[PDB]
């Protein structure tokens, strides 16, 4: 069947470069115009670039023009994208897609799986863990760490009932933040102690924070 497989994703720093590739199967690659499209996490689709079936002309989207370069190798069934002058804002899942019309419709009939590119200038930074004091809800803000992941447990793992750790958000600084909240009985606020245990293995940081009523 038609198959489009991207490769080349990763984490990279602003100002640096990255090259993505896409191998095609199931059709005569040299007969079709090919595109790259991107999708920032939790946002919509945005077109990046197109190359004609024979490599005679390329066109680029307004936010990537002059920084990204598309090329193809028709003998090897491969489409490439050279990304230079990377900005935080370029963080996204990148898809290659086939154009249906040989004369280029500028639409996309087959799409690959996509590959994530995260752009950040941050160095390994352990989090600042802050208590979110108060059925009552209480938790811990695990703020400003790099890179992913972080593990959050409650009371050295002893508590599981009603713990919800939310997805990390990559902030404009290029550092992540997340929260974990547990919902406990109001009677417990006297009978109990609650500690979130945070372990950020990339920076060898383990922090326990006691969440006390204010």
């Amino acid at each position: 069947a038609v198959k489009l497989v991207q490769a080349g994703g990763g984490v990279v720093q602003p100002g640096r470069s990255l090259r993505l590739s896409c191998i095609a199967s199931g059709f005569t690659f040299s007969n079709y115009g090919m595109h790259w499209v991107r999708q920032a996490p939790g946002k919509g689709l945005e077109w990046v670039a197109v190359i004609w079936y024979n490599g005679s002309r390329t066109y680029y989207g307004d936010s990537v023009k002059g920084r990204f370069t598309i090329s193809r190798d028709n003998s090897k069934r491969t489409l490439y994208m050279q990304m230079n002058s990377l900005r935080t804002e370029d963080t996204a899942v990148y898809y290659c897609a086939r154009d249906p019309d040989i004369l280029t419709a500028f639409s996309f009939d087959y799409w690959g799986q996509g590959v994530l590119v995260t752009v950040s200038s941050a160095s390994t930074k352990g989090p600042s863990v802050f208590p979110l004091a108060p059925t009552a809800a209480l938790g811990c803000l695990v703020k400003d760490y790099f890179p992913e992941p972080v593990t959050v447990s409650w009371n050295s793992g002893a508590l599981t009932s009603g713990v919800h750790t939310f997805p990390a958000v990559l902030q404009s600084s290029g550092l992540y933040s997340l929260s974990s909240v547990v919902t406990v009985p109001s009677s417990s606020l006297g009978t109990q102690t609650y500690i979130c245990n945070v372990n950020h293995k990339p920076s060898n940081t383990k922090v326990d924070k006691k969440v006390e009523p204010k």
Partner: protein, 206 residues
């Protein structure tokens, strides 16, 4: 440049309609894409009204003026997805912002909102983050807004995308970062969550 509603929710078997508008659309061909969570887009409509081979006959599209409408007759559960219109001109493809279609499978449920002020520790670090946690709502689409006294704040906000919980209801979080002097210069701060046209609000004061 293309406007689509953020979400639509319909009961199984009802007809869903999703509009896409722009003044240039009279002069352009529009295309529609379906994207299910985790998957890549699939083209469900080619050149304003044509249906690709492989796509169910319940999908159709029509044009009226500056608006093209995707119609899904007799919506099925499997049609729940984000739908994107797309168009363009000689040099570029442009996409609308996307519409979350929810095929209702349980009753609507209002969000629960908990808002936490910055801790003493954080303010001691000359820093301040307010955390708004939103849970147990269905359909999973919300608008989150922050206010300092009565003024809307847009700077310093980060909100995660709604995700299902076990219970099949959704949860999301939003953060507002401020300087300590900004925290002290207001009487209150609020997290306002709007879901199915009604707002839930929580307020904290310095």
């Amino acid at each position: 440049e293309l406007t689509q509603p953020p979400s639509v929710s319909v009961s199984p078997g009802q007809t869903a309609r999703i509009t896409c508008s722009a003044n240039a659309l009279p002069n352009q061909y529009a295309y529609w894409y379906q994207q299910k969570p985790g998957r890549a887009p699939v083209m469900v409509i080619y050149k304003d009204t044509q249906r690709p081979s492989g796509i169910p006959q319940r999908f159709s599209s029509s044009t009226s003026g500056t608006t093209v409408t995707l119609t899904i007759s007799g919506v099925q559960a499997e049609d729940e997805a984000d739908y994107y219109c797309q168009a363009w001109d000689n040099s570029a493809s442009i996409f609308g912002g996307g519409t979350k279609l929810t095929v209702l499978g349980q009753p609507k449920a209002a969000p629960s909102v908990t808002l936490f002020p910055p801790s003493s520790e954080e303010l001691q670090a000359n820093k301040a983050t307010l955390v708004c946690l939103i849970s147990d709502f269905y359909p999973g689409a919300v608008t989150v807004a922050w206010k300092a006294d009565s003024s809307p704040i847009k700077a310093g906000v980060e909100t995660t995308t709604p995700s299902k919980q076990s219970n099949n209801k959704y949860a999301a979080s939003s953060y507002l970062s401020l300087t300590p002097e900004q925290w002290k210069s207001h009487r209150s701060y609020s997290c306002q969550v709007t879901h199915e046209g009604s707002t839930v609000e929580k307020t904290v004061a310095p």
